């Protein structure tokens, strides 16, 4: 029968609760069963400062985080995460601290919540974790506790200490690997918390002290893959919005596939989701901070950060093979990707031919069937419209044929016109 | 640390190759795991001044570092209130020394040198720092290694891969040292403040790292391989891990999959006798942590999945394995509360009869096909859901096949264990719901408990007849008197379970048109009264049977329930009130054998 | 030649059964070989574990 969880006998059976809560022992198996009682009556019951006008639920929170820090033993630690969940969902004591209680809400993410979180979030005892990240995720759902996050991992990360960048990586890591994929997708500043979480993941990798390095090579090898495609849409999603700092997300992005690279970290509808992106940041004419402490307009500036972009993807097609035509996804794709790759190159005084030719030498010397795909397209815009680009050159038409068969009509015979540049642009 | 990539990216390489031409330069397990190099056989002590000399000592192959602080204790007479105040290690090298590891793994054998050793006065601190700190950077060279020998064994040609690992599982059956050195860890460090989050890290890491390494020998190696004793050293590991580091996630999931894995793989031993050697092991985890719901979750699809690969014989090797740690509040065996419990076993297997869904994603880790279907067309896709009277059904059919043997008496052990449960946790349901069709399969269930308990005594009239420097006299009236006293104790829990709660539910199942349907017949009566008399003709020669507990509860709570209005079931009484007639008289006649009688 | 034919595999069967009462898919192979053999937590019951499945590893060889 229904009997109401807000009613003022529930709240009084509540108030019994609080009286119990702040009551200590000073065996101790009589205290994870009196508490364990106690919690089994909160599931039933839902599917100085001035304190006398509160209500008792966030002073029972209160005492919670006060007793918090006081035991070791993960199974009333366990009991009390049980009753925390109650309260703050179930309950909806967070729900209406973040309706009309900001203030106090502002005290409650300040210096308690976040740090203790923080606190029990552990590798070894991994069930204490499997509890404490969705409310954790409530936590930096809302204002306010982004920023007590960012200084938290900027002065856990950034220690002059090595065991505190150790204890961070690991840290992240369990906040990492017990993540979802929809469940982030409204919020914007959580996106960007764990965005800077898994780039400061991804930092450690090549951290000057080689225990946290191979730790953090190690510790992403056990990412289930679901979770890993989210932090990628995450960081892609923080690339999409946030101007100023592609120069290191890109880094960040090349060591993820250089170490990860069974999942797509890079794919044709990556790269069609950027050509449109950089269209809408190029063929158009914040308030958050910079996480280059992470690691440490229409003409040129934009043009080179899709030059950059190119670079990126002269050492995809190098490293992998990246079938897209044994599939039928990914068709209009890549097919996009070879359309705008001939309509934005095709204006000699940019950086990007050099590196185009640069990059299709070891193209052509790694891959075959793309290779031999793409080769035509490459042909026809190698003069559509320099020393060591001259030996760059030279090498590109040395490696198109050396084991291609190019032999067609109206296309070999420009390669009369090629030794007739022998004599033209040496002359 | 930059090799684990430059082994990926350098090809023309074998197993062979690099121990031809690491022989040359006498640091061969320097390198990689697999390098068996013996070690040294014998040690030099230093001493400090003119007063000592150096001094030679053998080296065994279970030496340690405790017979030498022993030694060092008694040769210098050091007092030990000091004991944790000194320290031994070398001059040439500046090595300090963990105390609980092998020196065997420290110190190959030099070509007839041996290294030095020195007793020198410490302070405890700074000691025990630096014996943190260096096997902090010793086992990561181990983690090292294993990452080369992962590393190694991945993009290697796909003609040679099949040799390679079989001789890689050659040299690793060589090696003395294997598990030893693979599943051990440092406990005299793990509770320090200052390597606590530390040393669990790395070993997480490491055994993380040993199980893809055994993951990736186990495949390879074809289906039809002459699996001796081995696999068990093999498996071992696997259980090892789980002992450590039980409530960490990712041990957890790799686990699972990997067992996945190696029961795919070798079907045939993984059909008839390999599951003998992970269960115990399991059994005993999924009962202690029963306060921790995620190592739960991880064993209940680990065994849903061992059920949908294998269906049978898993059941069977699963009571086979689930037995020896089964204790009862038994008045013959006094079962303790410090092993798997009969509810935990029972809770498993009602976790085996439902769907488990999914939350910790252990298949994607699996390299065989999805959707796991049965390996053997002897059960195929016929509707084999898991039930538990056929787990009844199935101890019934391995008692009735040789009632004289082993397994016999182990699932008669077994079945005394689960269908108190049973029948105890169908009364918590069927008074649960209180509904007309929960009426309906309670009594469907109890008539088709009943026939295979009418099945389970129909096959036992190897166990009527009766018995023919004493230490086998006393194990061959164990094993006279444990399947007898099993089958009494089993059948007056029954009868005075049901009966009265069969009254019961069909006063209460909306008809009591059926009433007493008799659920034991005339011969199983009968049965019943040949195996007590069996048992009580050889009462007043061994003084412990008398206090039994299934003979007692026979007497007192089985006797006076029997009906006997009816004269077709009286020769079960006759029989018994002669056997009780010819003990007392025997107890009269004899005051001798009156002198020792309880 | 020898494989055209559906296959035929063995089965248990025993005769002394009220035979209202159906036996069990086991085969015989399978059989014959079968019937002819809080406080967790700490960290001194993993120890003891760890040196006992160490004796008995070294036990069975």
């Not at chain 1, 809560?21 to 001035?50: D, H, N, T, V």
């Not at chain 1, 940041?281 to 308030?287: G, Y």
């Not at chain 2, 190696?221 to 071992?236: A, C, K, Q, R």
Request: with cysteine; hydrophobic share 45%; net charge neutral.
């Amino acid at each position: 029968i229904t009997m109401g969880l807000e009613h003022s006998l529930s709240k009084d059976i509540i108030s019994i609760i609080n009286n119990v809560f702040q009551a200590p022992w000073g065996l101790c198996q009589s205290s994870i069963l009196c508490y364990q009682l106690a919690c089994e009556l909160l599931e039933r019951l839902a599917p100085k400062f001035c304190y006398q006008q509160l209500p008792v639920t966030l002073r029972l929170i209160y005492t919670i985080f006060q007793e918090m820090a006081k035991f070791e033993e993960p199974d009333i630690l366990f009991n009390m995460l049980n009753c925390l969940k109650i309260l703050c969902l179930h309950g909806e004591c967070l729900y209406i601290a973040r309706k009309d209680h900001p203030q106090f809400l502002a005290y409650i993410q300040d210096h308690m919540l976040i740090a203790s979180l923080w606190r029990v979030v552990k590798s070894e005892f991994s069930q204490l974790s499997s509890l404490a990240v969705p409310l954790l995720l409530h936590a930096l759902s809302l204002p306010h506790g982004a920023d007590i996050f960012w200084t938290i991992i900027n002065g856990n990360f950034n220690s002059k200490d090595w065991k505190m960048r150790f204890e961070a990586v690991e840290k992240v890591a369990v906040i990492c690997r017990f993540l979802d994929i929809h469940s982030v997708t409204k919020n914007h500043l959580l996106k960007y918390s764990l965005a800077h979480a898994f780039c400061c993941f991804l930092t450690a990798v090549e951290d000057v002290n080689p225990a946290v390095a191979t730790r953090a090579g190690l510790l992403l090898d056990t990412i289930k893959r679901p979770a890993l495609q989210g932090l990628c849409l995450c960081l892609d999603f923080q690339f999409d919005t946030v101007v100023k700092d592609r120069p290191t997300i890109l880094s960040k992005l090349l060591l993820l596939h250089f170490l990860k690279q069974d999942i797509p970290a890079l794919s044709w509808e990556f790269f069609v989701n950027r050509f449109e992106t950089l269209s809408l940041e190029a063929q158009l004419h914040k308030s958050v901070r910079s996480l280059r402490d992470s690691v440490k307009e229409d003409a040129g500036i934009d043009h080179q950060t899709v030059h950059q972009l190119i670079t990126v993807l002269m050492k995809f097609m190098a490293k992998d093979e990246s079938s897209a035509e044994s599939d039928i996804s990914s068709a209009k794709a890549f097919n996009t990707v070879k359309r705008h790759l001939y309509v934005l190159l095709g204006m000699r005084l940019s950086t990007c031919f050099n590196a185009f030719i640069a990059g299709i030498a070891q193209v052509m010397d790694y891959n075959i069937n793309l290779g031999k795909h793409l080769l035509p397209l490459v042909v026809q815009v190698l003069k559509y419209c320099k020393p060591h680009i001259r030996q760059m050159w030279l090498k590109a038409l040395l490696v198109i044929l050396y084991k291609y068969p190019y032999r067609d009509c109206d296309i070999s015979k420009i390669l009369l016109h090629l030794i007739h540049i022998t004599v033209n642009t040496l002359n | 640390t930059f090799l684990w990539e430059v082994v990926g990216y350098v090809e023309g390489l074998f197993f062979k190759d690099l121990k031809q031409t690491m022989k040359k330069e006498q640091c061969e397990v320097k390198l990689l795991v697999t390098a068996s190099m013996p070690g040294t056989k014998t040690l030099v002590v230093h001493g400090q001044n003119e007063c000592d000399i150096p001094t030679q000592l053998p080296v065994h192959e279970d030496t340690q570092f405790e017979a030498l602080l022993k030694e060092c204790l008694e040769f210098f007479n050091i007092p030990e209130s000091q004991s944790t105040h000194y320290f031994l290690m070398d001059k040439r090298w500046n090595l300090i020394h963990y105390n609980k590891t092998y020196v065997r793994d420290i110190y190959p054998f030099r070509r007839s040198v041996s290294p030095q050793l020195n007793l020198v006065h410490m302070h405890p601190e700074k000691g025990q720092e630096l014996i943190q700190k260096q096997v902090f950077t010793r086992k990561l060279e181990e983690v090292g290694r294993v990452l080369f020998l992962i590393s190694l064994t991945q993009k290697i040609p796909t003609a040679h891969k099949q040799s390679h690992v079989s001789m890689l599982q050659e040299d690793l059956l060589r090696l003395p040292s294997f598990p030893r050195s693979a599943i051990d860890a440092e406990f005299s460090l793990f509770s320090d403040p200052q390597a606590g989050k530390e040393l669990f890290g790395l070993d997480t890491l490491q055994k993380s790292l040993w199980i893809q390494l055994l993951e990736e020998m186990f495949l390879g190696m074809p289906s039809e391989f002459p699996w001796g004793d081995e696999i068990m050293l093999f498996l071992n590991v696997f259980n090892g891990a789980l002992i450590l580091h039980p409530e960490d996630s990712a041990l957890l999931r790799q686990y699972a999959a990997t067992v996945i894995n190696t029961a795919v793989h070798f079907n045939h031993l993984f059909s008839l006798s390999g599951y003998q050697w992970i269960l115990p092991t399991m059994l005993q985890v999924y009962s202690d942590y029963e306060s921790n719901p995620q190592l739960r979750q991880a064993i209940e699809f680990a065994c849903h999945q061992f059920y949908i690969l294998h269906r049978k014989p898993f059941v069977l090797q699963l009571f086979a394995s689930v037995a020896p740690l089964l204790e009862f509040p038994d008045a013959a065996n006094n079962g303790p509360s410090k092993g798997v419990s009969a509810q935990c076993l029972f809770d498993l297997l009602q976790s085996l009869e439902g769907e488990t869904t999914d939350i910790l994603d252990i298949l994607e880790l699996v390299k065989a096909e999805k959707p796991l279907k049965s390996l053997d067309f002897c059960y195929g896709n016929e509707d084999l859901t898991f039930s538990i009277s056929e787990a009844i059904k199935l101890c019934v059919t391995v008692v009735a096949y040789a009632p004289e043997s082993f397994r016999s008496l182990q699932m008669l052990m077994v079945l005394e264990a689960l269908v108190p449960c049973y029948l105890q946790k169908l009364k918590r349901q069927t008074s649960q719901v209180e509904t007309v069709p929960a009426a309906r399969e309670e009594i469907a269930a109890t008539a088709a408990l009943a026939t295979s308990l009418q099945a389970l005594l129909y096959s036992v009239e190897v166990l009527t007849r009766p018995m023919t420097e004493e230490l086998d006299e006393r194990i061959a009236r164990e094993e006279f008197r444990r399947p007898r006293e099993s089958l009494l104790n089993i059948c007056t829990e029954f009868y005075k379970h049901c009966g009265p709660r069969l009254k019961i539910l069909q006063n209460l199942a909306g008809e009591p048109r059926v009433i007493a349907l008799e659920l034991l017949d005339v011969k199983s009566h009968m049965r019943l009264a040949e195996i007590a008399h069996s048992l009580l003709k050889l009462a007043p020669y061994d003084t412990q049977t008398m206090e039994s507990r299934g003979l007692r509860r026979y007497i007192m709570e089985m006797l006076p329930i029997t009906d006997w209005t009816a004269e077709a079931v009286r020769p079960a009484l006759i029989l018994i009130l002669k056997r009780l007639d010819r003990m007392f008289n025997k107890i009269h006649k004899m005051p001798t054998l009156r002198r020792q009688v309880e | 030649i020898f494989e055209k034919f559906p296959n035929r595999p063995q089965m248990v069967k025993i005769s002394k059964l009220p035979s209202d009462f159906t036996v069990p898919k086991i085969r015989e192979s399978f059989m014959k070989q079968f019937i002819d053999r809080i406080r967790a937590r700490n960290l001194l019951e993993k120890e003891t574990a760890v040196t006992k499945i160490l004796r008995a590893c070294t036990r069975q060889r």
